Amino acid sequence: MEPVIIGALILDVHAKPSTTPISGTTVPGQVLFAPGGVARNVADCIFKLGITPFMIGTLGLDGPANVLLKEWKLSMKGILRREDISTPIVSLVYDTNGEVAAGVAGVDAVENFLTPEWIQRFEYNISSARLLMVDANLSSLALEASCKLAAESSVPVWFEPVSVTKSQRIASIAKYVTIVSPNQDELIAMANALCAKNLFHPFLSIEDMFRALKPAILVLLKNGVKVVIVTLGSNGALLCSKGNPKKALLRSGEVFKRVQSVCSPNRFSESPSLFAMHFPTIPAKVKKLTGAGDCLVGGTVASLSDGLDLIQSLAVGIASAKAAVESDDNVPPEFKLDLISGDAELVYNGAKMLMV
Amino acid sequence: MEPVIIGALILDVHAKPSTTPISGTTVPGQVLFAPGGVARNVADCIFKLGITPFMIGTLGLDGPANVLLKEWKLSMKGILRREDISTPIVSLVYDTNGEVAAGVAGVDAVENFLTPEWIQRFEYNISSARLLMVDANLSSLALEASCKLAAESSVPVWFEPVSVTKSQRIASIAKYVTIVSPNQDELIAMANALCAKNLFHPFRENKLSIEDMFRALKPAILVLLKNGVKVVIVTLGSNGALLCSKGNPKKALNIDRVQSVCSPSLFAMHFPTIPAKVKKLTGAGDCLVGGTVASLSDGLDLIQSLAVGIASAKAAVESDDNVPPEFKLDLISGDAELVYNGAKMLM
Ligand SMILES: Nc1ncnc2c1ncn2[C@@H]1O[C@H](COP(=O)(O)OP(=O)(O)O)[C@@H](O)[C@H]1O
Ligand SMILES: Nc1ncnc2c1ncn2[C@@H]1O[C@H](COP(=O)(O)OP(=O)(O)O)[C@@H](O)[C@H]1O
Ligand SMILES: O=c1[nH]cc([C@@H]2O[C@H](CO)[C@@H](O)[C@H]2O)c(=O)[nH]1
Ligand SMILES: O=c1[nH]cc([C@@H]2O[C@H](CO)[C@@H](O)[C@H]2O)c(=O)[nH]1
Ligand code: NA
Ligand code: NA
Numbered sequence: 242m243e244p245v246i247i248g249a250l251i252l253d254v255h256a257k258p259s260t261t262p263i264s265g266t267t268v269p270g271q272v273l274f275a276p277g278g279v280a281r282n283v284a285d286c287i288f289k290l291g292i293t294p295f296m297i298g299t300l301g302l303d304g305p306a307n308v309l310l311k312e313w314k315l316s317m318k319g320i321l322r323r324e325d326i327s328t329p330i331v332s333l334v335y336d337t338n339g340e341v342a343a344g345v346a347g348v349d350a351v352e353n354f355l356t357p358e359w360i361q362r363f364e365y366n367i368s369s370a371r372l373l374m375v376d377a378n379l380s381s382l383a384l385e386a387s388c389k390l391a392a393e394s395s396v397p398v399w400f401e402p403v404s405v406t407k408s409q410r411i412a413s414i415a416k417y418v419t420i421v422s423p424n425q426d427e428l429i430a431m432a433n434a435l436c437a438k439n440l441f442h443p444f445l446s447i448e449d450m451f452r453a454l455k456p457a458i459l460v461l462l463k464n465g466v467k468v469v470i471v472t473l474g475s476n477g478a479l480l481c482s483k484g485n486p487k488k489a490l491l492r493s494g495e496v497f498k499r500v501q502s503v504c505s506p507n508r509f510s511e512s513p514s515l516f517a518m519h520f521p522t523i524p525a526k527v528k529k530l531t532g533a534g535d536c537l538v539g540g541t542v543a544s545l546s547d548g549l550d551l552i553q554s555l556a557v558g559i560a561s562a563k564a565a566v567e568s569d570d571n572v573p574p575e576f577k578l579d580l581i582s583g584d585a586e587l588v589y590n591g592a593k594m595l596m597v
Numbered sequence: 598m599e600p601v602i603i604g605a606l607i608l609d610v611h612a613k614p615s616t617t618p619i620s621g622t623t624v625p626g627q628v629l630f631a632p633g634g635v636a637r638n639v640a641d642c643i644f645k646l647g648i649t650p651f652m653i654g655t656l657g658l659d660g661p662a663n664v665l666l667k668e669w670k671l672s673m674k675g676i677l678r679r680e681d682i683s684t685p686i687v688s689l690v691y692d693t694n695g696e697v698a699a700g701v702a703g704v705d706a707v708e709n710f711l712t713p714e715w716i717q718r719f720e721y722n723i724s725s726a727r728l729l730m731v732d733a734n735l736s737s738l739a740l741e742a743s744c745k746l747a748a749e750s751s752v753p754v755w756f757e758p759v760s761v762t763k764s765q766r767i768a769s770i771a772k773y774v775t776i777v778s779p780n781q782d783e784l785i786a787m788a789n790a791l792c793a794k795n796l797f798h799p800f801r802e803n804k805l806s807i808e809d810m811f812r813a814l815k816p817a818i819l820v821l822l823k824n825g826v827k828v829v830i831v832t833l834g835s836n837g838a839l840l841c842s843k844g845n846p847k848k849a850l851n852i853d854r855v856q857s858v859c860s861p862s863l864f865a866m867h868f869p870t871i872p873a874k875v876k877k878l879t880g881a882g883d884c885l886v887g888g889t890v891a892s893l894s895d896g897l898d899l900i901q902s903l904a905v906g907i908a909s910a911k912a913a914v915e916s917d918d919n920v921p922p923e924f925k926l927d928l929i930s931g932d933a934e935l936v937y938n939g940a941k942m943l944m
Contacts, residue, residue: 252660254610254628254686254688256686256688256701256703257701258701262699262700262701263699264697264698264699265696265697265698266697266700267687267689267697267700267701267702268700268701268702269701269702269703269705270701270702270703271683271703272610272683272686272687272688272701272702272703273683273686273703274659274660274661303667304630304663304664304667305630305664307663308660308663308664311660330610330628330630331623331628332610332612332628332688332690333623334688334690334699334700334701336620340620340621341620341621341622341623342620342699343614343618343619343620343690343698343699344618344622344623344624345612345613345614345618345623345624345625345626345627345628345690346623346624346625346626346628347612347625347626347627347628347629348625349627404622404623404624405619405621405622406616406622406623406624406625407625426621426622
């Protein structure tokens with residue numbers, strides 16, 4: 242009853258310039274390949290926490306595909322591969338402080354070839370899934386078909402917004418989506434999509450940052466999303482939900498055990514239209530920020546798959562995202578459950594109710 | 598006794614966004630890979646014209662190498678590959694109107710790993726080569742090591758200046774070098790590099806008659822020749838190329854179709870190019886070199902060879918890649934005749 246992950250496998254090109262990138266010209270720097278794609282990163286993170294996901298995606302029969310699959314240890318039954326498909330490539334240029342200065346995504350293969358017809362071959366996997374995660378590299382039609390199959394079996398759906406542009410694909414499926422995980426910029430675009438208007442604009446205290454984002458969050462909840470997680474980079478994450486967050490969504494494995502013992506379900510005092518809490522992250526030595534949000538998703542889905550409640554699960558997601566930033570890859574080579582559970586407790590014990 | 602090409606194999610990444618790139622996020626667009634590296638491009642043109650070159654270079658045992666080598670169908674014997682080497686990549690992000698908005702080049706592996714020590718492994722190939730082509734991605738020590746092995750066997754050396762910056766590496770090897778192929782800016786940098794003072798100023802504004810551009814550049818050209826360079830080919834983009842030499846330019850290689858159609862002490866000649874609908878300009882110069890080296894390799898004189906080089910570069914600009922998928926030798930010999938019959942003596 243594995244979680245099912247649907248979306249892009251992408252070959253990332255990461256260009257870290259040694260000096261400030263200058264318009265019109267090339268500067269020296271470090272340029273590397275890394276396995277990427279939001280759905281792939283999530284699946285990867287889940288796997289490394291000891292849960293086996295089922296990946297549905299598409300790849301070429303080309304060089305970049307060979308790179309992505311070199312260390313692939315998951316099933317490939319769900320991956321559509323054909324000679325006429327061009328493996329997706331993302332090109333990132335960072336600034337000197339590790340933020341994306343410019344990024345271009347060539348993900349045509351996912352929009353054109355990762356179709357409802359392809360996804361429906363795996364109707365069984367989806368209906369029996371503990372949870373379905375779809376990323377926004379999917380076409381609207383692929384998203385709709387996916388979410389409906391999930392709903393028909395009341396399988397909870399996680400929508401990953403991917404980027405400011407693609408996040409607006411929440412629009413055609415919001416009533417089917419259980420959880421979304423945007424950053425501040427994607428949240429705004431998603432709210433504008435669901436209002437069918439450019440009402441909200443992009444951009445300090447945690448409290449003011451929440452008050453700032455609250456209307457946007459409400460637009461998402463009013464349109465049927467049950468849980469909104471807003472990731473705030475080095476400031477952690479907001480958890481907002483329709484009603485009690487624990488009550489918004491085989492026997493447990495080891496991830497459950499350690500975390501269940503130290504992140505007690507009886508930690509928080511005591512339903513409400515808007516529930517909001519802030520989760521801190523942990524001091525980290527940053528090597529590469531890219532993909533941390535994806536590991537937050539994977540860590541959260543892993544914990545949920547293993548039976549943890551949502552609040553305990555997000556604490557693990559944040560621990561996982563910390564491990565990810567402290568690595569030079571999108572997803573760490575490995576996870577130390579020692580540090581993961583320890584950090585999760587740190588995050589969990591530091592969490593604060595917002596509307597008090 | 599194949600020509601030996603030593604230099605960079607680089608993976609070019611071209612990212613063309615559908616909307617204005619926004620910081621903090623990715624926008625949809627097209628991202629393309631293309632085989633690059635000046636010396637690799639040169640070998641590529643040589644091979645596609647039917648001459649088999651020998652490549653000496655360096656790559657990682659990594660992902661970009663895997664992609665880069667997907668269509669490589671030459672020997673790998675001369676290529677140093679190690680797990681600790683990061684394959685060179687140049688990554689460009691364009692704006693919506695097709696000009697470069699941001700670029701990063703990580704091509705240090707060539708200088709750090711393509712060492713004299715590696716190059717000396719192929720002393721046999723270099724000494725028996727009909728021609729040695731080195732690009733300026735090589736470290737100075739690597740350039741010196743390469744050029745000395747050639748000179749000692751009187752193998753002619755072609756130096757590709759690569760860029761305004763790297764063109765300055767000519768300074769310690771100029772006496773070993775037979776031919777250089779700078780564009781207008783690289784020529785200026787090379788002359789300032791060899792000169793006692795930075796006398797020459799770069800081009801800034803209105804374009805000049807070709808005979809007036811030669812007089813402008815002639816002192817710089819003289820600096821190179823006086824420092825031991827035998828032949829200076831200055832490429833002039835849409836205006837073709839200048840060929841200047843010590844003594845008569847009708848020089849062949851000491852070795853033993855176009856010849857069918859192109860009938861055979863400071864000399865200067867202008868070679869016109871051919872009207873072309875440009876698709877991507879980048880790397881055309883590398884095919885001028887490869888086309889010329891191919892022709893020289895097949896026994897043509899320099900004047901016939903440069904005409905082919907210009908034909909080859911015209912085909913290059915009319916393609917989306919650095920080097921065309923193939924060469925239609927029908928069309929090349931045809932363009933070559935045009936260029937050759939169009940060549941003009943200045944001095
Ligand atoms: N500098 C950091 N130190 C510690 N944790 C971080 C840092 N940056 C990001 N994280 C963790 O990664 C998560 C995702 O970060 P964010 O940048 O908001 O998402 P995205 O990767 O989608 O842009 C954050 O919620 C936080 O939990
Ligand atoms: N518009 C064009 N049409 C035909 N040939 C061209 C055109 N532009 C450039 N070339 C060929 O490319 C060669 C090198 O171009 P140039 O811009 O001078 O060097 P680089 O490519 O090194 O910058 C020229 O000598 C010319 O033969
Ligand atoms: O349009 C897209 N942009 C960026 C990504 C992925 O985001 C990853 C980091 O979160 C990154 O690996 C990139 O491939 C994508 O899948 N689609
Ligand atoms: O430092 C360098 N930058 C770019 C190139 C190559 O020049 C090619 C075009 O002439 C292009 O393929 C690029 O890779 C190089 O060889 N050294
Ligand atoms: Na990282
Ligand atoms: Na071209």
